[PDB]
């Protein structure tokens, strides 16, 4: 056996925003009552793109943690570059705690890597009161009612779409993957097409916003984001379900009362359904020597549903419900916000990510940020992740028919 206290770090990349249950006071009630694994849970400090290559650095160094946040999306890429510890044997004990979905993502090959965190399905997050002002009475449902409505609100100054060139690679991919995949295993090879109808619908939906001058052009990471939302001019727009807190945060209240959560309207081909931004897993590192305690510990954190909640997350665990914390129905016209992303969740398209795709993500954002000022279309934004995919997958070595 191990010895009377094993050590066991874990690194995250979870917000710890004011009003947030910390992940380390989560972490700090798992240390009081078992002395015989602890655990240091530290946010890594930087930018989100970064973390994995972080690990990289570290897993070579030999001074990676135990645990780590990885995103579905990039699990593939960090199996394949050698990163994660087979867990297969102890994931299995605690598959019952989560959904099968989300638990399938820590899989590859029918082998476990760690285990699902939370689910990133997009919908809508709009300023009801403002809305009305603009006699926009129900959230459209086709993209020409939309297209409309939005060019209603932009010439009054309002806008009720945003464009984010710096998330085009998580929730650009996410709104055109909701109606088919990218990327497919055909026994010795992978076949891709990034080209696909959602793809081409979500390319003219924001097309003809950007157009029109209908959308806004913030990164959704820059303050000119935060301060359209606090000026009272962005009213509407999608976003990943684990915003919300982000997202009142960045409001500085403005609009608290009047803001609603809708499920995406049939403007991306997505034909009812939706899709994918972000969204992780927590793995299990190559040279951990201790998976079995790192797992048992993982499922504990995993499974405080209201504490993961309250960092925004829309939990893969099933062990109780997610409620919607009294805050956040405040702000949004108390409606159960947590709800309708359960909804979305239950909506959303699978969609498999190849290995490398961080480097498709890097060219889409490139690519998307120059559809602002007209000097690139959106449509690009597909063409060039379809030659970036396969020139990847190429560079891991992999075939590509
Ligand atoms: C999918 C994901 O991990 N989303 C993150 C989100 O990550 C994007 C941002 O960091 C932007 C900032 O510009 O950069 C994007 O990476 C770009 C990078 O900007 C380019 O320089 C480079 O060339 O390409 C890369 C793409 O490879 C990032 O993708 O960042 C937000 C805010 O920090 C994160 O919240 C979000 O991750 C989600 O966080 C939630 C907690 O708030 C949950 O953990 C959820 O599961 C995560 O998916
Ligand atoms: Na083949
Ligand atoms: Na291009
Ligand atoms: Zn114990
Ligand atoms: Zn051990």
Redesign the pocket.
């Known amino acids: 056996d191990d010895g009377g206290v094993v050590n066991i770090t874990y690194m995250?990349?979870?917000?710890d925003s004011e009003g947030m249950t910390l992940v380390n006071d989560i972490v700090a009630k798992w240390n009081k009552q078992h002395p015989d694994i602890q655990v240091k849970a530290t946010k890594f400090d930087g930018?989100?793109?970064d973390?994995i290559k972080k690990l990289e650095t570290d897993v070579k160094s030999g001074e990676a943690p135990d645990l780590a946040?990885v995103?579905?999306?990039?699990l593939p890429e960090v199996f394949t570059k050698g990163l994660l510890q087979d867990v297969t044997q102890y994931a299995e004990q605690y598959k019952n705690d989560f959904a099968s979905g989300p638990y399938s993502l820590v899989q590859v090959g029918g082998k476990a890597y760690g285990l699902p965190?939370?689910?990133?399905p997009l919908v809508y997050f709009y300023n009801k009161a403002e809305f009305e002002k603009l006699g926009i009475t129900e959230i459209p449902q086709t993209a020409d009612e939309f297209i409309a409505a939005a060019k209603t609100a932009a010439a009054a100054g309002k806008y009720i779409m945003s464009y984010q060139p710096?998330?085009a690679?998580?929730m650009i991919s996410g709104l055109a993957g909701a109606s088919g995949g990218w990327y497919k295993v055909k026994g010795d090879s992978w076949v891709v097409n990034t080209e696909t109808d959602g793809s081409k619908a979500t390319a003219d939906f924001y097309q003809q916003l950007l157009d029109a001058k209908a959308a806004t052009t913030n990164?959704?990471?820059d303050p000119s984001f935060d301060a359209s939302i606090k000026d009272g001019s962005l009213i509407g727009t999608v976003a990943?379900a684990?915003?919300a807190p982000?997202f009142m945060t960045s409001s500085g209240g403005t609009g608290s009362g009047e803001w609603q959560v809708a499920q995406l309207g049939d403007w991306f081909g997505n034909a009812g359904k939706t899709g994918p931004?972000?969204?992780?897993a927590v793995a299990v590192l190559k040279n951990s020597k201790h998976p079995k305690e790192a797992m048992e510990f993982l499922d504990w954190f995993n499974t405080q549903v209201p504490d993961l909640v309250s960092?925004?997350?829309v939990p893969a665990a099933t062990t109780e419900d997610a409620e919607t914390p009294s805050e956040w129905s405040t702000f949004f016209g108390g409606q159960d916000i947590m709800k309708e992303f359960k909804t979305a969740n239950n909506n959303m398209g699978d969609f498999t990510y190849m290995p490398g795709?961080?480097?498709?993500?890097?060219?889409?954002?490139?690519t998307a940020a120059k559809a602002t000022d007209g000097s690139g279309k959106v449509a690009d934004i597909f063409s060039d992740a379809q030659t970036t995919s396969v020139d990847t997958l190429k560079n891991f070595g992999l075939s590509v028919s």
């Open positions: 995250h990349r979870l917000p930018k989100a793109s973390m946040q995103g579905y999306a990039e965190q939370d689910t990133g710096d998330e690679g998580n990164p959704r990471w990943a684990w915003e982000l931004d972000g969204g992780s960092q925004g997350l795709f961080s480097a498709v993500a890097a060219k889409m954002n490139e």
